[PDB]
Amino acid sequence: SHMIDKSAFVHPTAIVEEGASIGANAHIGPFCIVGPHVEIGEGTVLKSHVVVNGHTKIGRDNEIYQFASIGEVNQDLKYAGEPTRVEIGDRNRIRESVTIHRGTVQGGGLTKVGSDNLLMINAHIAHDCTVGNRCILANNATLAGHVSVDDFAIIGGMTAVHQFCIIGAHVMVGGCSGVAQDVPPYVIAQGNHATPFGVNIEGLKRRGFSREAITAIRNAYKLIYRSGKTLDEVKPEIAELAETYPEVKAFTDFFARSTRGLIR
Amino acid sequence: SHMIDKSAFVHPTAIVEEGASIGANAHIGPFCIVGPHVEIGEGTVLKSHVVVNGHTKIGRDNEIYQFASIGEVNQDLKYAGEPTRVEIGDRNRIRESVTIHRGTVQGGGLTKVGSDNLLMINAHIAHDCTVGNRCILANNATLAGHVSVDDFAIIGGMTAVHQFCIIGAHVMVGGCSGVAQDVPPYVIAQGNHATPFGVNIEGLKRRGFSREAITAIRNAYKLIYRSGKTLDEVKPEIAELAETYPEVKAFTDFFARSTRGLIR
Amino acid sequence: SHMIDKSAFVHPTAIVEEGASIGANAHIGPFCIVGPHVEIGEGTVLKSHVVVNGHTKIGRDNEIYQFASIGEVNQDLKYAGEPTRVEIGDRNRIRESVTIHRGTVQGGGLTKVGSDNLLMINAHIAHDCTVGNRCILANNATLAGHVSVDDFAIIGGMTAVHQFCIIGAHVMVGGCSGVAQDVPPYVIAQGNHATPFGVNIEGLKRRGFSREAITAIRNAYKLIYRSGKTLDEVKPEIAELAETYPEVKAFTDFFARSTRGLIR
Numbered sequence: 001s002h003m004i005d006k007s008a009f010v011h012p013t014a015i016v017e018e019g020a021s022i023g024a025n026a027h028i029g030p031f032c033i034v035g036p037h038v039e040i041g042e043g044t045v046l047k048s049h050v051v052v053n054g055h056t057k058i059g060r061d062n063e064i065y066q067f068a069s070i071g072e073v074n075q076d077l078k079y080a081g082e083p084t085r086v087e088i089g090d091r092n093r094i095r096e097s098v099t100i101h102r103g104t105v106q107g108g109g110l111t112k113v114g115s116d117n118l119l120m121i122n123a124h125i126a127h128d129c130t131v132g133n134r135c136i137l138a139n140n141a142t143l144a145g146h147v148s149v150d151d152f153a154i155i156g157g158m159t160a161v162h163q164f165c166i167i168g169a170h171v172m173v174g175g176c177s178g179v180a181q182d183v184p185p186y187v188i189a190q191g192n193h194a195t196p197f198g199v200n201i202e203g204l205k206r207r208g209f210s211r212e213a214i215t216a217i218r219n220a221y222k223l224i225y226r227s228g229k230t231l232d233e234v235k236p237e238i239a240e241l242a243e244t245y246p247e248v249k250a251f252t253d254f255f256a257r258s259t260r261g262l263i264r
Numbered sequence: 265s266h267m268i269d270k271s272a273f274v275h276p277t278a279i280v281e282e283g284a285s286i287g288a289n290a291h292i293g294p295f296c297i298v299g300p301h302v303e304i305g306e307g308t309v310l311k312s313h314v315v316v317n318g319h320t321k322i323g324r325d326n327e328i329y330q331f332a333s334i335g336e337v338n339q340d341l342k343y344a345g346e347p348t349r350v351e352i353g354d355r356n357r358i359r360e361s362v363t364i365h366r367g368t369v370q371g372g373g374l375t376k377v378g379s380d381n382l383l384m385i386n387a388h389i390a391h392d393c394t395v396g397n398r399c400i401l402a403n404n405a406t407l408a409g410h411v412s413v414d415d416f417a418i419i420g421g422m423t424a425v426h427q428f429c430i431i432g433a434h435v436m437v438g439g440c441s442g443v444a445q446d447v448p449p450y451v452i453a454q455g456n457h458a459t460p461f462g463v464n465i466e467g468l469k470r471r472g473f474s475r476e477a478i479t480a481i482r483n484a485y486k487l488i489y490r491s492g493k494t495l496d497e498v499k500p501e502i503a504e505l506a507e508t509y510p511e512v513k514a515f516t517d518f519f520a521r522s523t524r525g526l527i528r
Numbered sequence: 529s530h531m532i533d534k535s536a537f538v539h540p541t542a543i544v545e546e547g548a549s550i551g552a553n554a555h556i557g558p559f560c561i562v563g564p565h566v567e568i569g570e571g572t573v574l575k576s577h578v579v580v581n582g583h584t585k586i587g588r589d590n591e592i593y594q595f596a597s598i599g600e601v602n603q604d605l606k607y608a609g610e611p612t613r614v615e616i617g618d619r620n621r622i623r624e625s626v627t628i629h630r631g632t633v634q635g636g637g638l639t640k641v642g643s644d645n646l647l648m649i650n651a652h653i654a655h656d657c658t659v660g661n662r663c664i665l666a667n668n669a670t671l672a673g674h675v676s677v678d679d680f681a682i683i684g685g686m687t688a689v690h691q692f693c694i695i696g697a698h699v700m701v702g703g704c705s706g707v708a709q710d711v712p713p714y715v716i717a718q719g720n721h722a723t724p725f726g727v728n729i730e731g732l733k734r735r736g737f738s739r740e741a742i743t744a745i746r747n748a749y750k751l752i753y754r755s756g757k758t759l760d761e762v763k764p765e766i767a768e769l770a771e772t773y774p775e776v777k778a779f780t781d782f783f784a785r786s787t788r789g790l791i792r
């Protein structure tokens with residue numbers, strides 16, 4: 001803490017401010033700027049030309065590419081320099097020009113990214129976002145403020161997710177989409193505004209979901225989208241299904257967090 | 265002029281060419297490049313890794329973030345190094361990777377941005393554009409050449425405005441739009457190609473327009489879009505309305521500048 | 529080879545690794561990074577803040593702007609550091625934040641860009657892409673992996689081309705498009721997903737195609753899109769037409785490479 005490990009490498013052209021913590025076998029490349037409240041974990045690499053600032057904690061074995069901006073002042077017009085936070089986990093691939101901004105006081109104070117994510121060129125994570133584990137944001141994918149992207153979700157290229165929206169686990173959002181409402185777990189969404197196109201079967205298969213689990217999830221999707229019933233009508237029905245198929249509880253948990261209605 | 269104020273701060277790693285003017289309490293951060301024909305006003309901050317060049321005048325209390333390119337050679341295939349210009353006013357927040365390019369001789373020689381604007385990540389202002397005051401360009405918003413964005417207008421994320429188009433004052437263009445024709449003042453536009461969706465009532469309310477003014481503006485919108493008359497038929501009618509409600513004159517002034525027809 | 533020409537200029541702040549080849553009257557600007565397996569041809573300019581790495585060959589009289597990343601590790605999840613390649617030809621204008629990534633072993637090992645191209649701000653050329661000569665990628669235009677863009681083709685702003693797709697010569701793809709299938713030569717495409725809108729007549733006229741050639745190309749387009757016949761039905765017919773009008777052979781050559789079907 002507030003120490004640069006003797007096995008970390010800091011390029012002579014880099015500027016790491018006194019107070020920064022840099023772990024064993026980390027690598028700060030040329031022309032990087034690292035502020036005094038940053039913590040960079042073991043084995044993390046900033047290739048070159050990376051700016052990291054604010055109250056920002058980055059885990060182990062991350063790879064952050066040139067022209068990325070991590071921890072920076074957010075774009076919220078109300079933000080006025082309060083000491084809000086960014087947390088990033090482990091083994092993320094954070095590509096050229098990615099931006100990850102600090103929270104706002106009003107939004108909870110924290111922008112959080114988990115582990116094993118791929119954030120492709122110019123992906124944007126606004127203030128107060130929460131990204132889980134094993135997600136993909138393709139090139140130019142943009143999360144406006146207060147967005148949640150749950151585990152394994154893919155946000156396609158050139159896609160915007162509007163403020164406060166929740167993207168459930170194992171979702172796939174097609175490229176060139178505008179997501180203006182909440183996307184239930186396990187769903188394929190595409191378009192502007194994005195609408196649902198069935199369950200992400202190929203994803204669930206690849207990720208080892210059982211036959212029974214995928215059938216149950218398709219049954220939950222049909223309750224929401226095909227039954228023609230109200231969401232409040234089908235909530236008990238989905239809970240009843242989840243009593244046998246635990247993967248269906250993700251719908252229940254998602255309904256509790258959803259504030260924008262569902263894409264339809 | 266051609267002087268660096270004794271109260272300006274220039275990082276030792278920055279490269280400011282002889283001839284540049286830098287005002288009192290300006291701050292040029294690490295790895296910035298500032299060319300010889302640049303003028304930077306009092307209190308302006310280039311955070312780090314900013315390139316400013318060409319015949320470029322930047323006002324007071326701007327905040328320009330890393331990886332921005334301001335004044336650079338434009339993308340017009342006819343441009344051949346002529347000494348065209350950029351002018352930027354005061355109190356702008358110009359975020360990471362924004363690009364603002366110099367004019368072309370054929371297009372009038374000047375790209376101009378006013379004051380109190382927010383240009384979000386990777387917004388683009390092409391050659392010969394004119395942006396007013398208190399505008400917002402959201403992430404990846406792109407103005408192709410010779411575009412005007414009038415005061416208070418918001419261009420949503422991932423939106424392109426095609427060359428020569430005029431966006432009137434207090435417009436809101438939705439995210440993921442393609443604007444291929446002119447947008448009258450006070451209008452909501454969305455889609456690809458963008459089409460009108462009524463007056464920006466919430467914006468006008470927030471910005472202190474009177475009840476009478478907003479009703480008059482809605483009446484002007486109905487003349488254009490609902491009356492089913494020709495634009496040339498309803499111009500006198502809108503001028504007549506403006507004789508009582510001065511805010512309606514913005515329509516008249518806009519018609520005189522519009523060359524691409526109106527979105528419909 | 530492995531030599532810096534005595535007439536090349538390397539800024540003192542640049543970092544060019546031992547083994548890099550830099551030709552006569554090349555210019556490496558401030559804060560550039562050039563790796564040991566890079567070759568930069570005569571007269572090429574890296575303005576500032578450019579990263580060039582990997583097994584990468586860049587020709588003569590290129591202009592590469594700040595915050596570009598050329599030769600970098602690609603975004604393919606299977607790629608694991610294999611010594612794949614980028615080749616770039618001559619007289620390209622490669623604008624701010626452009627990304628051009630190295631190949632994958634599985635995709636053929638090479639990303640290739642020809643000559644006299646304009647790659648506008650934040651254009652992206654993924655692993656295993658092939659871009660010809662005199663192409664334009666407008667701002668934020670994105671080629672996903674294994675895409676071909678043939679000579680004179682224009683990819684509009686904010687447009688994504690999905691993996692493996694082929695864009696034929698003299699195509700124009702409109703801004704804000706998603707191209708999910710193959711685009712025949714000489715065709716205008718727009719939308720999400722992009723659909724065809726006739727032949728690019730204005731382009732062909734500007735580029736000196738004969739009257740007879742343009743009529744023949746329109747006749748080939750009608751066979752594909754208007755005749756209501758199968759593609760396999762009209763292939764002989766298009767070959768027969770090409771026996772008189774050589775420009776129609778581009779259709780034949782294109783059919784042989786197309787794997788995703790045609791946009792329709």
Ligand SMILES: CNC(=O)CN(Cc1ccc(-n2cncn2)cc1)C(=O)CSc1ccccc1Cl
Binds near residue numbers: 138155176671708
């Ligand atoms: C109809 N098909 C689509 O929409 C495909 N797709 C969604 C998508 C995206 C990525 C994945 N990955 C799976 N493993 C790793 N990545 C899967 C699905 C797009 O985003 C296309 S555009 C694009 C695509 C890639 C890069 C840049 C751009 Cl611009």
Ligand SMILES: CNC(=O)CN(Cc1ccc(-n2cncn2)cc1)C(=O)CSc1ccccc1Cl
Binds near residue numbers: 077143161162400403
């Ligand atoms: C249907 N609603 C929309 O389209 C919302 N919107 C327009 C818009 C945009 C901004 C404002 N601001 C108002 N005060 C400050 N900013 C208002 C309306 C988008 O651009 C969404 S996408 C996006 C949004 C924000 C950042 C990045 C991205 Cl990508």
Ligand SMILES: CNC(=O)CN(Cc1ccc(-n2cncn2)cc1)C(=O)CSc1ccccc1Cl
Binds near residue numbers: 408444664700702
């Ligand atoms: C319906 N018309 C369109 O879609 C126009 N267009 C296609 C296009 C694009 C470029 C050319 N060039 C021809 N010589 C040089 N460039 C021609 C056609 C767009 O890409 C518009 S958006 C945009 C446009 C330009 C820059 C940034 C953005 Cl974002």
Ligand code: NA
Binds near residue numbers: 259
């Ligand atoms: Na809820």
Ligand code: NA
Binds near residue numbers: 519523
């Ligand atoms: Na006019």
Ligand code: NA
Binds near residue numbers: 783784785786787
């Ligand atoms: Na084929």
